[PDB]
Amino acid sequence: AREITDIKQFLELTRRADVKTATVKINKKLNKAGKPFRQTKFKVRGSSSLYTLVINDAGKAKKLIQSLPPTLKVNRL
Amino acid sequence: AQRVTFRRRNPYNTRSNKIKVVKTPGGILRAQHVKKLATRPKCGDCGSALQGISTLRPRQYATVSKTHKTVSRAYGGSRCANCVKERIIRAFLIEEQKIVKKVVKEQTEAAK
Amino acid sequence: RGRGRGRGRGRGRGRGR
Amino acid sequence: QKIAKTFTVDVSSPTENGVFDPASYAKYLIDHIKVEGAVGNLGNAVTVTEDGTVVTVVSTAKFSGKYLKYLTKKYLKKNQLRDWIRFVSTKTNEYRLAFY
Amino acid sequence: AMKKVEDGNILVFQVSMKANKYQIKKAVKELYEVDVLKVNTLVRPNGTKKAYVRLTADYDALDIANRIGYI
Amino acid sequence: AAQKSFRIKQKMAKAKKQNRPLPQWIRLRTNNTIRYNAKRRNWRRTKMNI
RNA sequence: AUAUGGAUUCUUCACGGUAACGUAACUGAAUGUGGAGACGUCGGCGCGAGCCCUGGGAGGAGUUAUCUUUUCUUCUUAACAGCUUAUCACCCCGGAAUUGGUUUAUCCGGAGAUGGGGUCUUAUGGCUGGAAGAGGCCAGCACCUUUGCUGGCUCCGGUGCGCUUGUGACGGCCCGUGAAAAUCCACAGGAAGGAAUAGUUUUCAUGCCAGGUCGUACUGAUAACCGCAGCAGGUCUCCAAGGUGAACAGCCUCUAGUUGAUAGAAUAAUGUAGAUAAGGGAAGUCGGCAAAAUAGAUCCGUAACUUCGGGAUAAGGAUUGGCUCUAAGGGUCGGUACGAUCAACUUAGAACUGGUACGGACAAGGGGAAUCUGACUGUCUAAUUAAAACAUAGCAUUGCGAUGGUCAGAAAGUGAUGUUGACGCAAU
RNA sequence: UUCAAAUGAGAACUUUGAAGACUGAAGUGGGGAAAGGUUCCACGUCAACAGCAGUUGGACGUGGGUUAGUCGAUCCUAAGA
């Protein structure tokens, strides 16, 4: 129920030694007045609150997925 | 055109049984019990509500941090910030008056 | 017993004088 | 500022059974669409084209998808066709006629 | 009660009226060598006490329920 | 009601178990004179008065 | 319970802002002080929420002899979290009469207004997370079947003396000024404990464990409660759609819920309930009992008397439909002048029209002239007497200055008035 | 209130469909307090009860059902005891 705006702080939450489940949500949204785009939401389940990070750019969406540790169980959609 | 019922066992419109109508994500109208509203803290002698202090229920004041219940100036969360400055003029002038009255008393028995 | 069976008090009925 | 919207009706399904005529249905929309009041104001606003299997309506005036369904339902009642023909929408602004 | 065993992973037992949730959790934990997640109790209208013992995800209710003998 | 003490609910449980007809096999016993349950209670005819 | 990170400390127990005050943190014992808890009623006004109304668009259903870009329905966002946001209030600059500011309601200003620049409270609202993955509305498929599978859409706005409710700042009223405690916090205070090769704070962030006992079904009433009962009686409270209209009145409808009260066949008398009557109009009767008439709104007009407040809706008259128009009453935007555009039911007026009807059903004061009596509002004989009886304000008398007056108790190291003191209490 | 069908030994009264109506939202709607105590739900039954009837029932017989660290009691005090 908490939103994180920093991508460097987001990577520290994935190695907090207690987070076991993470989810990536793809949202079909649209821009100001024109074409639709691909919105992504990376949600990490902690022990007391759910942290989320939203990226509106598809270029940085794929780059962050490979940066996640492999010990963290990622749930696609 | 949708009516709602109480969510607790109390069927009377008491001061602790207020109801707010809330639209749920399910698409139906549903009542929501709201708590009695908090009152702002008041100053000890002027009666006005001092600023800078959060307005909460007394027992949930122990959960908020220190900065929400006090002001960095002395007599912060008790006085009106003009009540403090009023008792500084009085504390400085009276003690200055109490020592110039002590030398007037000295004038009497030293010259009679 | 009820509102009927009136015999006792009376305006001009029985049990007068 | 007044970009037009295209409405396409699929007429392939009922015409294979022989009970529907695309040319007769297309003319019904010409003399029944009301623009700025009464009938007969298609001043480069509404155009109806057909190729024999689909009817395409391109309108730049006030013309919604509910008005197209309302006029089509009146055409089927005139020809006594509101018991094997429905006016459904496969997607946005693209309609079809289901015979079944 | 048996319908809850296969899907809810909840065992239903009859419990003495003097026992509380600590004693039910302790007795089940060693009489059947299981782990108890939560205990829910109620007083039945006939004067008895019914307890809903839910096991953790490490154990299953069905293969333990027939270990006592009832099914 | 519906918010009652345990003492009231404990007496309601005893009355539920006593609401039963006479068992059939008792009537076949030797020197048996009981023919029906004479202490039967119903909520429509007699209130139990707590 | 303790740990990790952060913060502070060699100026030992933090910095910034003139100020209001601000921050992720940033030792505080005995004791003292303050605040919250913690409060009447009515009135209008501002704001918010839900509902009502409505436009565009995307779906589904209804009607179609004729008409109707039509009628109906779906388009939803919880607790909680982060940021932000206002009336009031406060601070700094400044020094006002040619007095200014300002509310629906007249209060404020050299005890510092108007103005300029800021601070704070976060009820509430706004955005984001929660959260579409949900729910909802449809389409396309599979098929005895466990029954699913696959696609879509779920959008953007407007309006108000509206209804319900919450709240804010005020005003009116009192010989009535309209609870208490548990509990929580702050401040004052400076007792103690503490750094340099190292410490302290779990009111900073994160992580760990645990949260027992009892109630929980249903009815809540023309059948589940009390009345001898499956009795037209009695019994506390919350939620409140559309039209007509001043209206939570009466009347009709939507959601929701019922169609349950022994039936059938005939239509005599007498009944109960509802009605209508020519001519006369209280001749009836102890008695205008009962019934009838009057009735809403707008305009005109309104006596004797009076404590000058009333009487008064006095009495007494006229108008009221439909349709077609006219006039008046506003909001928002760029300028030292005027337009453009948008949105409300309120009032007034004029023609035309009719079997002269028009508060067309519903709803809805009879009035006047005098006497007796009580001043009035109010109260009582539950189940025959609601009154001129009681009470009332006003007026008057009496007792009492506490070792006392009045009254209670078997007694009492006992009480009521009395948390009282003659503008009081007690007795008439 | 009416028609048809179903069930049944048996239907003016049960169930379903259709039609006509009413309560008109200060309701014959949806919830609770006091009170009742299993009336709640399912299956089976029609001797008695439902002042007619009954295949139906708040009836009879047999079983099922009430899950809380966050809702209440528990705690505080009022008039008082």
From Swiss-Prot, chain B:
Q: Which residues form the signal peptide?
A: none
Its keywords, alphabetically, are: Cytoplasm, Ribonucleoprotein, Ribosomal protein
Q: Which GO terms describe its molecular function?
A: structural constituent of ribosome
- Does the record's keyword annotation contain Ribosomal protein? yes
What Pfam families would the database entry show? Ribosomal_L34e
RNA-binding is among the record's keywords: no
Q: Name one GO cellular component term.
A: cytosolic large ribosomal subunit
Tell me which domain of life the UniProt entry assigns to the organism this sequence originates from. Eukaryota
- According to its UniProt record, where is this protein mainly located? cytoplasm
Q: Where in the cell is it found?
A: Cytoplasm
Xref: PROSITE patterns: RIBOSOMAL_L34E
One GO BP on record is:
ribosome biogenesis
**Other notes:** Present with 23600 molecules/cell in log phase SD medium. There are 2 genes for eL34 in yeast.
State what this protein does. Component of the ribosome, a large ribonucleoprotein complex responsible for the synthesis of proteins in the cell. The small ribosomal subunit (SSU) binds messenger RNAs (mRNAs) and translates the encoded message by selecting cognate aminoacyl-transfer RNA (tRNA) molecules. The large subunit (LSU) contains the ribosomal catalytic site termed the peptidyl transferase center (PTC), which catalyzes the formation of peptide bonds, thereby polymerizing the amino acids delivered by tRNAs into a polypeptide chain.
Family, similarity comment: Belongs to the eukaryotic ribosomal protein eL34 family.
Q: How does it assemble?
A: Component of the large ribosomal subunit (LSU). Mature yeast ribosomes consist of a small (40S) and a large (60S) subunit. The 40S small subunit contains 1 molecule of ribosomal RNA (18S rRNA) and 33 different proteins (encoded by 57 genes). The large 60S subunit contains 3 rRNA molecules (25S, 5.8S and 5S rRNA) and 46 different proteins (encoded by 81 genes).
Swiss-Prot record, chain D:
Kindly list the biological process annotations in GO that this record carries. cytoplasmic translation
Listed as disulfide-bonded, the cysteine pairs are none
Provide the alphabetized UniProt keywords. Cytoplasm, Ribonucleoprotein, Ribosomal protein
Q: Subcellular location, in the record's words?
A: Cytoplasm
**Which GO molecular function annotations are given, in alphabetical order?**
RNA binding; structural constituent of ribosome
Query: For this UniProt entry, what's an example GO CC term?
Result: cytosolic large ribosomal subunit
An additional note in the Swiss-Prot or TrEMBL entry is: Present with 60400 molecules/cell in log phase SD medium. There are 2 genes for eL22 in yeast.
Oligomeric and partner information:
Component of the large ribosomal subunit (LSU). Mature yeast ribosomes consist of a small (40S) and a large (60S) subunit. The 40S small subunit contains 1 molecule of ribosomal RNA (18S rRNA) and 33 different proteins (encoded by 57 genes). The large 60S subunit contains 3 rRNA molecules (25S, 5.8S and 5S rRNA) and 46 different proteins (encoded by 81 genes).
Known role: Component of the ribosome, a large ribonucleoprotein complex responsible for the synthesis of proteins in the cell. The small ribosomal subunit (SSU) binds messenger RNAs (mRNAs) and translates the encoded message by selecting cognate aminoacyl-transfer RNA (tRNA) molecules. The large subunit (LSU) contains the ribosomal catalytic site termed the peptidyl transferase center (PTC), which catalyzes the formation of peptide bonds, thereby polymerizing the amino acids delivered by tRNAs into a polypeptide chain.
Family designation: Belongs to the eukaryotic ribosomal protein eL22 family.
Q: What is this protein called?
A: Large ribosomal subunit protein eL22A
Gene behind this chain? RPL22A
Counting on the full-length protein, the chain here runs from: 9 to 108 of 121
Curated annotation (Swiss-Prot), chain E:
- UniProt keyword list: Cytoplasm, Isopeptide bond, Ribonucleoprotein, Ribosomal protein, RNA-binding, rRNA-binding, Ubl conjugation
> Chief location of this protein?
cytoplasm
Residue ranges annotated as transmembrane are none
Any idea where this protein resides? Cytoplasm
Keyword Metal-binding among record annotations: no
One GO cellular component term, please give it: cytosol
From the UniProt record, give one GO term of the biological process aspect: cytoplasmic translation
Q: Which GO terms describe its molecular function?
A: RNA binding; rRNA binding; structural constituent of ribosome
Source taxon at top rank: Eukaryota
The job of this chain, per UniProt, is described as: Component of the ribosome, a large ribonucleoprotein complex responsible for the synthesis of proteins in the cell. The small ribosomal subunit (SSU) binds messenger RNAs (mRNAs) and translates the encoded message by selecting cognate aminoacyl-transfer RNA (tRNA) molecules. The large subunit (LSU) contains the ribosomal catalytic site termed the peptidyl transferase center (PTC), which catalyzes the formation of peptide bonds, thereby polymerizing the amino acids delivered by tRNAs into a polypeptide chain.
Family label: Belongs to the universal ribosomal protein uL23 family.
Q: How does it assemble?
A: Component of the large ribosomal subunit (LSU). Mature yeast ribosomes consist of a small (40S) and a large (60S) subunit. The 40S small subunit contains 1 molecule of ribosomal RNA (18S rRNA) and 33 different proteins (encoded by 57 genes). The large 60S subunit contains 3 rRNA molecules (25S, 5.8S and 5S rRNA) and 46 different proteins (encoded by 81 genes). uL23 is associated with the polypeptide exit tunnel.
Full protein stretch here:
72 to 142 of 142
UniProtKB/Swiss-Prot annotation, chain F:
Does the record's keyword annotation contain Cytoplasm?
yes
Name any one GO molecular function. Answer: structural constituent of ribosome
TM stretches of this protein: none
Name the Gene Ontology biological process terms: cytoplasmic translation
Q: Which Gene Ontology terms of cellular component type are present?
A: cytoplasm; cytosol; cytosolic large ribosomal subunit
Q: Which Gene3D superfamilies match?
A: Ribosomal protein L39e (1.10.1620.10)
Name the protein family. Answer: Belongs to the eukaryotic ribosomal protein eL39 family.
Keyword annotations: Cytoplasm, Ribonucleoprotein, Ribosomal protein
**Which regions form coiled coils?**
none
Q: Which PROSITE patterns match?
A: RIBOSOMAL_L39E (PS00051)
Where does this polypeptide localize? Answer: Cytoplasm
Q: Where is this region: Disordered?
A: 1-21
What broad class describes the main subcellular location of this protein?
A: cytoplasm
Q: What is this protein called?
A: Large ribosomal subunit protein eL39
Which residues fall in a compositionally biased region of kind Basic residues? 6-19
**Keyword flag Isomerase:** no
What does the subunit comment say? Component of the large ribosomal subunit (LSU). Mature yeast ribosomes consist of a small (40S) and a large (60S) subunit. The 40S small subunit contains 1 molecule of ribosomal RNA (18S rRNA) and 33 different proteins (encoded by 57 genes). The large 60S subunit contains 3 rRNA molecules (25S, 5.8S and 5S rRNA) and 46 different proteins (encoded by 81 genes). eL39 interacts with YIH1.
